[PDB]
Each structure stands twice: as structure tokens, then as C-alpha cells.
Write a protein that binds this DNA or RNA. Structure first.
Ligand SMILES: [Zn+2]
Length: 348
DNA sequence: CGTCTTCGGCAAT
DNA sequence: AAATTGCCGAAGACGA
């Protein structure tokens, strides 16, 4: 029902005053940490890349969860793919400020993460904030209300790795030209061990690209810039995130839904966007149909145990090695029930 | 639909 | 030398 769904979206709208106070807290702490990190020889080129739901304007309910990336431009990077995981890599260099973190010829994520956490932990000790598989490296809690997931990332301005070359299938949606422009942007490597865990791997990150697409998301260049062209893409993504968040809350005592994340819902949403490239397939009048497309596609991913990373097609976020069949069957069952009953979890 | 706020990029430092 | 900073305007909450 499109009218019930719109009522859900109204309840999900963030408070402008809450945004204001929350942003003030996050920005103060983040700037404090960046200022400290830039004083260290190792994190000399550190910069802020804001990522995730809040900076994509798909944060729901309250602005109480911020993801930030502390990125380091690194020179002359040489990637070695770990096994054939397609997303995990050993970092090498082709005399540089990260030489202390080298363990042989590979860059030690562990060594780097340790100094990163150490510096942040020390800086938080003097601030009302507290510190709490490598990425996010650190989670802050500001005034018991606001959580900040801080991810260390290497920035490579090199062309994207070969495993991405069939990814980002935006050609018929955002255009081949936009795909070419996005793939000229840097890519990021975050410390993330690969599963026995290889503790020195880095995973490809494209959070900046994900943010760019979401804030410039139409086939039409003027999508959502005027009244006539307000699509429901972000509305559906928010509904999908609320659906997952509510299901995860409703079954928090069970453990089946713990591994599912907003990134899964966001990734699925980008695939539905690829399957539905035209803004007219996201008309505001069709919020119900569009949400059901997202729900249906997500259920297909659960059932087939395939949710491709939007950028790395052979990296299956729903692989057996990542999420148990039983966890997907459980989500499938609950989503199917939810849909068959006008989504009871939305009222709560 | 105008007002207000926040964020992102980047000349100008 | 190269990291810092102020400024612009889109995005979105909000009230009228
Ligand atoms: Zn739009």
C-alpha cells in the first residue's frame, strides 16, 4: 500500500535539530582526530571521506550512526589478489611514509591498524567520547548517543583492479560516460581479513562511488531536482533499510539476522536500479510497486544465495562462507511473511 | 515553496 | 610545498 508506505517514510524522516546537534558532535570529534593524525609521519596524507547512509541521505529514524573513512593517498601501489577472492588484496609498493608498516614486501594491515587505533584511542582519552575484522578499525560513542565507525583506508589513484571491470553495470541507467568518469576516480582499500583468517589483506572499497550514485541517481540529470521528477529510489532504499532494521530488532534474540547489514540492502538496491534504469520505473505514484521490486529482488538474492558486490561481480556477499543458508532462509521466510501481511514490522 | 542547515570540492591560501 | 580554509549551492527538514 503506497499510502501506508508514505506514512512509514514520514516517521523515518530525521529531525533537523537532531542532525544539527549530531553533526556538530561528530564533526568536532572527527576534526580533532584528523588534526592529530596529520601530525604523525605515517598518516601524513590522511583525509576525510564521509561514507554510508547519513552522507547518502538514506539515514532513517535518527542521525545516530555515522560512518567515516580516514583515507591515505599511497603512492605506486601494487596489488596482489589474495587467493581468488576478487576483493581481497595484499598491498605492495613499486622511501615512503608507510615503510614502517611493511612486513617483508607487503603492507601490514595489522601493523597499520594498530598504530591507527593507538593514536585514536589516545586522542579520545582526552576528549565526552569513548572508543569501542579490521574495518571499521574503531567505533566511537559520543555522549552515549552517537556512534561513529571509523575506517582506515588506502587511496589508490591507479585504475581499478581487473575484478571490477565487469562491475558497476550502470551503462543503461547512469550512462557509459558516467561509468567512465566514476572509474577514473580513486579506489580504496580497507584493512579486512579474508576467511582461518589471512590477517594482512585489504578489501576494495567504493563507498565514495556509492555515495556519488545515490546523490546523482537518475537516468535524467534533473531527477529529484524539481517537483515533476521526484523519483522514489531513496524512498525504497530507506524502506528496505527499515524493513531489515525492524526485522533485525524483532528477532534480535535469535541470531539469524546478525550478519545482514544496510550494505546488503544498499547493494541489492543498486542491482534493482540496474534492472530498472528508467526514472519512470521509480515514479512516486508507484512507491508500492517499486518497493516490491526491491523486496522481490532481495528475496531472490536470499533464495539463490547470490548478492553480487555491485563493483566486484564475482564477490558474492551472500556466499555460504559469509552467511549461513539457515540465516538466509530465515530472512526469506520473515520477509515473505511481512509482505503477505502489509508489513507488520513497519508499525511496531 | 521559501528558509534554514549541512556537506563536498576546490581555488586561494 | 602542499595541506588548510572559506565559500558556493544542492539536498532535505520544516513551517507557512
Ligand atoms: Zn530521483
Amino acid at each position: 500500500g503506497a499510502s501506508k508506505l508514505r506514512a512509514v517514510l514520514e516517521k523515518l524522516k530525521l529531525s533537523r535539530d537532531d542532525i544539527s546537534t549530531a553533526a556538530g558532535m561528530v564533526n568536532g570529534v572527527v576534526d580533532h582526530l584528523l588534526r592529530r593524525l596529520k601530525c604523525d609521519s605515517a598518516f601524513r596524507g590522511v583525509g576525510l571521506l564521509n561514507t554510508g547512509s547519513y552522507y547518502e541521505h538514506v539515514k532513517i529514524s535518527a542521525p545516530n550512526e555515522f560512518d567515516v573513512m580516514f583515507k591515505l593517498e599511497v603512492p605506486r601501489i601494487q596489488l596482489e589478489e589474495y587467493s581468488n577472492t576478487r576483493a581481497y588484496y595484499f598491498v605492495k609498493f613499486k622511501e615512503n611514509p608507510l615503510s614502517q608498516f611493511l612486513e617483508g614486501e607487503i603492507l601490514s594491515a595489522s601493523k597499520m591498524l594498530s598504530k591507527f587505533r593507538k593514536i585514536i584511542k589516545e586522542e579520545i582519552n582526552d576528549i565526552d567520547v569513548i572508543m569501542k575484522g579490521g574495518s571499521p578499525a574503531v567505533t566511537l560513542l559520543i555522549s552515549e548517543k552517537i556512534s561513529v565507525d571509523i575506517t582506515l583506508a588506502l587511496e589508490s589513484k591507479s585504475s581499478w583492479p581487473a575484478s571490477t571491470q565487469e562491475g558497476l553495470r550502470i551503462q543503461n541507467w547512469l550512462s557509459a560516460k558516467v561509468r567512465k568518469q566514476l572509474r577514473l576516480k580513486p579506489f580504496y582499500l580497507v584493512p579486512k581479513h579474508a576467511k582461518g583468517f589471512q590477517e594482512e589483506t585489504w578489501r576494495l572499497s567504493f563507498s565514495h562511488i556509492e555515495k556519488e550514485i545515490l546523490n546523482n541517481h537518475g537516468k535524467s540529470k534533473t531527477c529529484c531536482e524539481n517537483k515533476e521528477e521526484k523519483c522514489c529510489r531513496k524512498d525504497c532504499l530507506k524502506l528496505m533499510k527499515y524493513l531489515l532494521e525492524q526485522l533485525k530488532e524483532r528477532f534480535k534474540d535469535k541470531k539469524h539476522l546478525d550478519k545482514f547489514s544496510s550494505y546488503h540492502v544498499k547493494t541489492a538496491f543498486f542491482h534493482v536500479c540496474t534492472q530498472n534504469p528508467q526514472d519512470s520505473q521509480w515514479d512516486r505514484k508507484d512507491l508500492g510497486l517499486c518497493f516490491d521490486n526491491c523486496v522481490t529482488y532481495f528475496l531472490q538474492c536470499l533464495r539463490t544465495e547470490k548478492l553480487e558486490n555491485y563493483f566486484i561481480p564475482e564477490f558474492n556477499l551472500f556466499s555460504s562462507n559469509l552467511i549461513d543458508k539457515r540465516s538466509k532462509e530465515f530472512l526469506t521466510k520473515q520477509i515473505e511473511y511481512e509482505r503477505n501481511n502489509e508489513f507488520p514490522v513497519f508499525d511496531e
